[PDB]
Amino acid sequence: ASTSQVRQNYHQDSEAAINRQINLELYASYVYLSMSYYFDRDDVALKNFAKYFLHQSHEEREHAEKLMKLQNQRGGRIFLQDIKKPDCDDWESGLNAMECALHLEKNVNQSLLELHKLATDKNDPHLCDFIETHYLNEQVKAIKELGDHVTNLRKMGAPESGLAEYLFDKHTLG
């Protein structure tokens, strides 16, 4: 119960929202992990898709860690939840994985936007700045990159052209 000695201008609702966001970032890490190893299957075998999604997975773990650090910086208390498995076991194709990643990042961005709204409603400028500085532009860039990737794959003839996915793997992700 008793307060943290550091706590100031940090609403309990913001504290809870940061714990939800921690879960979401870990969930995103897990989705990209799954995607990565899909492309490492002997019957998929797109090694640069695999590295690309692994890198993205590790990023998301870093995003979670920074929110954990924030929780403590502000005197909130971290409460972890189960990290749900991804929706898919088999991601179908390079294009479909990229489409799923785009939708994931748009979902994560919507959560961060709700979090910023809350921080604004509770007049927490430090939390607003945090989210702006470390998260919002990183989402806009990720979203733009994924859209670019989907566009290229589509134009190249994916998913039906295995050639298209192979060449994208070498030229864009390589």
Residue 13 vs 72, nearer CB to a copy of itself: 72
Near a copy of itself in 98-157, by CB under 8 A: 102, 106, 109-110, 113, 116-117, 120, 123, 125-126, 128-133, 136-137, 139-141, 143-144, 147-152, 154-157
Residue 68 binding result from a copy of itself, Mg ion, Cl ion, none, given CB thresholds of 5 to 8 Å by partner type: a copy of itself
Decide if residue 16 touches a copy of itself (CB under 8 A): no
Nearest to 49 by CA among 65, 32, 61, 63: 32
Please tell me what DSSP assigns to residue 133.
Answer: I
Decide if residue 60 touches Mg ion (CB under 5 A): yes
- Rounded distance between C-alpha atoms, residue 129 and residue 16, angstroms: 18
Binder among 12, 42, 43, 77 for Cl ion (CB under 5 A): 12
Half-sphere exposure for 66 (CA within 13 Å, toward CB): 13
- Rounded distance between C-alpha atoms, residue 121 and residue 101, angstroms: 30
